[PDB]
């Protein structure tokens, strides 16, 4: 049932700004959306780095309770490992966490949902959608 993998950027964008456009897409694609543990730690970091952690955590908890958090498996690691190497030979710069999110999607064959496509665009074998 899972088709889309929500990245960190599109997530934080949604939690902070709560855009209406994203609400409809979320309500429509409910059940086919998931995030990576990599994405999770990042949103946890944001909440824990704030002066009102508990408040922000709860907001996050509501978000997470409606989707599935997939665990970074050996498959994700393998794919990302390859990916990292490929980008190196090509000299394309992608951030670490983002590299892992991309690998996680490839391992499970999911669609990356982002607001910054240009970032994931360098990696090959990836279908990306901009829900911004």
């Amino acid at each position: 049932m899972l088709k889309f993998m929500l990245d960190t950027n599109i997530c934080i964008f949604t939690i902070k700004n709560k855009p209406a456009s994203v609400r409809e897409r979320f309500n429509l694609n409910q059940g086919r959306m998931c995030i990576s543990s990599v994405t999770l730690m990042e949103v946890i970091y944001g909440a824990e780095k704030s002066q009102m952690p508990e408040r922000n955590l709860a907001v996050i908890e509501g978000f997470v309770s409606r989707i599935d958090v997939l665990d970074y498996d050996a498959a994700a690691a393998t794919h990302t490992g390859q990916i990292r190497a490929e980008l190196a030979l090509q000299g394309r710069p992608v951030g670490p966490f983002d590299q892992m999110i991309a690998g996680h999607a490839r391992s499970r064959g999911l669609i990356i949902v982002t607001n910054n496509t240009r970032e994931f665009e360098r990696v090959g074998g990836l279908r990306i959608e901009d829900w911004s």
């Binding site: 902070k16 944001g46 309770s65």
Partner: protein
């Protein structure tokens, strides 16, 4: 309003009083488990509750601080 929890079909179920009765059009709903709180929402309006309330504080880092 308060209510009772009963068992039906070998699982938990909750009676909702007429004071808190959902619109008749709503046949399919979606339950979300946030801690001990269950959020029943009409199917297709699952994110409405989260988007409406649940305001995040202003200090919430809008960037990402990803090393790079």
């Amino acid at each position: 309003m308060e209510t009772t929890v009963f068992l039906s079909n070998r699982s938990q179920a909750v009676r909702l009083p007429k004071a808190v009765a959902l619109p008749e059009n709503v046949k399919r709903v979606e339950v979300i488990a946030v801690g001990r709180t269950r959020i029943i929402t009409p199917a297709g309006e699952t994110w409405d509750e989260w988007f409406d309330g649940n305001s995040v504080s202003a200090d919430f880092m809008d960037n990402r601080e990803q090393p790079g």
